[PDB]
Design a protein around this nucleic acid. Sequence first.
RNA 1: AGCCAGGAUGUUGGCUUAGAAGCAGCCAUCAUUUAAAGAAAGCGUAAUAGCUCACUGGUCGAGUCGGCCUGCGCGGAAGAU
RNA 2: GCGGGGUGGAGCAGCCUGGUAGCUCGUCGGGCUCAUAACCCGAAGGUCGUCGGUUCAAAUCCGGCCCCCGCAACCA
Lengths: 361, 38, 68
Amino acid sequence: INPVNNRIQDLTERSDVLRGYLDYDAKKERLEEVNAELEQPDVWNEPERAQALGKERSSLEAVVDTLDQMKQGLEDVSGLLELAVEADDEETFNEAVAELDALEEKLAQLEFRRMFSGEYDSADCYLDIQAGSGGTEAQDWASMLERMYLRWAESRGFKTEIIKESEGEVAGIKSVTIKISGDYAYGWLRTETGVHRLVRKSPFDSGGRRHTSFSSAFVYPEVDDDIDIEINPADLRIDVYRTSGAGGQHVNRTESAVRITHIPTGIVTQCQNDRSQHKNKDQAMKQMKAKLYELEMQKKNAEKQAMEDNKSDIGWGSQIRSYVLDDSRIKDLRTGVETRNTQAVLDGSLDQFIEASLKAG
Amino acid sequence: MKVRASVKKLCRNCKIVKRDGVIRVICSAEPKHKQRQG
Amino acid sequence: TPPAAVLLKKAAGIKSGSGKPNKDKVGKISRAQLQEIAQTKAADMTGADIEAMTRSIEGTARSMGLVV
RNA sequence: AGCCAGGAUGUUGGCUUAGAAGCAGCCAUCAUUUAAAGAAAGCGUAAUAGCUCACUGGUCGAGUCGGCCUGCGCGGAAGAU
RNA sequence: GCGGGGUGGAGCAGCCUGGUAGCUCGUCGGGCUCAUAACCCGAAGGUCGUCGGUUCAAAUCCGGCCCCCGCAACCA
Ligand SMILES: [Mg+2]
Ligand SMILES: [Mg+2]
Ligand SMILES: [Mg+2]
Ligand SMILES: [Zn+2]
């Protein structure tokens, strides 16, 4: 009974949090404005505008109608629970429990969508941990972070494997790459990207001074393998001509050199090494395929390099989560969530921080 | 006018007519259906 | 008279009952309930024999997806 | 063949959809009014709508339909004094 | 077209001549050290590119297929 009331209060707070995160007043006003515009005849004068307003109305209607139905269901379940407890009706109590479970699953589906609105949130992920400013202390801290994330993955039921690892010579690990597989693994882990600051009496200092070490965790989704696309022959222009420095009547006369131009790109390859035009054309086609693939590879490398330049350095001022063990306090800089059970957090109780980050969005 | 080797009735309003030794498809409903064999 | 489909849904106590009807039955209704539904719309319904209205409503429910 | 009437109802069958009304599909695809009227064959509408049409009645009054085998032809069919 | 190769994580042997997988580093466990390296004492790890054939039996012999190397590709 009291746990059911606590569940109802939690659902009420979750519904209010959803309404306020979504600014239910703002969304309802926007929906009303869209309704007025759509009642106006001039709205369909621009078909793209009318379709956009229709899709916007459908989404706003989904949200608004879902919330309007949800609130009423919660009030009804509260009333039926009061009646069932008063009348000591076990069947009605069980029916109300089933209704509350169904409504909780519904609100949970909404919460899940809001938690993972990102495109690749469903995919598996890769986690890279790199030591930073602390040196040997940083490498030990990196090993601690690796253990923490592995424990958290075990708790969530995801499957982990170690693709690559580089261990520090004195202690810890310099870097590690781990593959995480599971449902919405990237969605659950993507908020842990950043630099983690650690403050503890360094075990690698003879004086036992209080040093600060930094380690970086970077989470990226598992990209799907690209489908190979054969070159559409209508995209190529092939020119056959005499090769340079042609020696002899035959070579002077024959059109052996081949040049292939890719119309969409403008990239050109050319081969004239062989006597045979067919062999030259095959080699030029291979070079054209290689050049198109290299162009795509250069695009991919540019994206990766932009990400590397975007990655903040593993050092002072780049912390997003501070683990101070002397003060026995862990604080997330982004969300403000603070805990004192450093041992539990190091053992894998990351759900508080991760859920806070996802709710903040 | 679609000039091609295989001329056919594309809808119920298309009609096959032979004019001046040429097979033609004339349509009273869709101008796109106008065809000449060639 | 109000539409037959919403009345059928109200009698059922179901919201969505049309996806894959023959492959797996989503809902089901009883003939007596259908007949009781039918009698109330007799003013606008085009018929004198209520049996005909009842079987028309049954066919409507079947089209909806619910097996009688 | 034209030609004249008609060419209904539950019902926009429901879902999924942004909308889905025979005509995006998915998806059932029935019974009723009967002369007959498809939960639609096509056109068409953002959707309806609308336009047909299948079906059926009424006037006119001898053929009409579309396959099979076969003979001869037609298109497909552009080149350099 | 003619030759070579593909074997523990890496580099090399073993093929010829069918029966059997070795060396060096690397990895793991225990020592030494305040600790790391070095060093010392122990372990583990390859069913031999991929299929097929031949054989009582194939790293080995034969044939495809894949990858890698060399050469050759001329007069023209
Ligand atoms: Mg020469
Ligand atoms: Mg001919
Ligand atoms: Mg052997
Ligand atoms: Zn036509």
